[PDB]
Amino acid sequence: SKSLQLIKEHDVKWIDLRFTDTKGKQQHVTMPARDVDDDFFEYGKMFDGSSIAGSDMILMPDDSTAVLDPFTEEPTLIIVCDIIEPSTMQGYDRDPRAIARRAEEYLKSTGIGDTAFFGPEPEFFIFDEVKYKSDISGSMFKIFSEQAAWNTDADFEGGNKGHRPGVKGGYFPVPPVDHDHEIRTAMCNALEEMGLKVEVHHHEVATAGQNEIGVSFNTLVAKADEV
Amino acid sequence: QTLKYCVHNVADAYGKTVTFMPKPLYGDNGSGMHVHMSIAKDGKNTFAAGLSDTALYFIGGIIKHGKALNGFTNPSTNSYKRLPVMLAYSARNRSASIRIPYVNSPKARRIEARFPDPSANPYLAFAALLMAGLDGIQNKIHPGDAIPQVCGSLKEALEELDKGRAFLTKGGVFSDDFIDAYLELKSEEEIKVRTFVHPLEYDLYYSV
């Protein structure tokens, strides 16, 4: 199918099966590419979900979302998988992807419509470093950022180029002021290599390196995987 | 002058250091030298909200020559980093540059002016306040009822002093030559302060 075609095209060596826990943190388990066959797609892998926050459960791959990984030098193909209960062979009750599929099927069953379109724009922060601890002794979340508005007099390895965005004034500065143009371009390139149809990227309102990369829309489960 | 002496040396004794400039801090309260004026006459109190008409004329003289008084009671480019600016008087209001404390005795009735700052020379500031009050009393200047504001920069305060020195040069209390020399000194001082780069300008305009 799709995954086999990509494996043949790019000589993929590893298959990375990815799912999502309740907390929303993506989980991945790797496997050799030589094990991909009919039985891999009809049975899936198995793993112990007991230590996942929220026993044995089947990782059933979804071949419609096979996409190359642009970070690993070894060519690895990423496959987003569903969680199947071995007792019932149906989608897991607590699997967020299964819940999203159930929601889209409910939408197409009530007759209101089909293929609900979700386009999310999430914003993120770029920091040079970050430190945080919290124990009986004390707590702290010190934050380090060369482009931060509070570093106007700091000492940097290389120099303090005093061009930096002020607080609540980092919205659309030119590259001399925003230190994140090239890294945002690299993020956009990686997203495109992962099949994401990006549409805009810029510096957000915040100082200390807030960026946004808006990408194109899709259906419920497709957009969840895309996010 | 003795108070400044003692405070400075006692600070030095413990290794600390006292400053008397009105505003050594931004983002926090400055320091002001409030002045309580109370003219007496043959042992009685002239200023007896309980203020006689003469006290109101004194306040009117202070109000009328407020910017010209700012050349002596506020002879500092710090003084206008602190500016109690509204040149009005009240007995309880905290937004008036002139206040009348709730004295418990009719003998101790006095007015308080809040714009002067400790950086002012005591002799010159006190003489300027008294001369303005005397002018207002002699000319029967009614202050009104409980709007002008004091100056906002030493440049305009010096300009107003140059244009309103007339009441000081009454009876020879202030010589015109002394006022001219004082104005030239303060003008060179203000010029020195004004034409020097501010780090806030590096905060604002460095990238633009």
Curated annotation (Swiss-Prot), chain B:
Subcellular location: Cytoplasm
Keyword line: ATP-binding, Cytoplasm, Ligase, Magnesium, Metal-binding, Nitrogen fixation, Nucleotide-binding, Phosphoprotein
Name recorded for this polypeptide: Glutamine synthetase
TM segment ranges: none
GO CC term, one of those recorded: membrane
Family, similarity comment: Belongs to the glutamine synthetase family.
Covered range of the whole protein: 235 to 467 of 467
GO terms classed as biological process: glutamine biosynthetic process; nitrogen fixation; nitrogen utilization
Binding site for Mg(2+) 1: 34, 112
Source species: Azotobacter vinelandii
Main location: cytoplasm
Chain's role: Catalyzes the ATP-dependent biosynthesis of glutamine from glutamate and ammonia.
GO molecular function term, any single one: glutamine synthetase activity
Residue positions binding L-glutamate: 29-30, 82, 94, 114
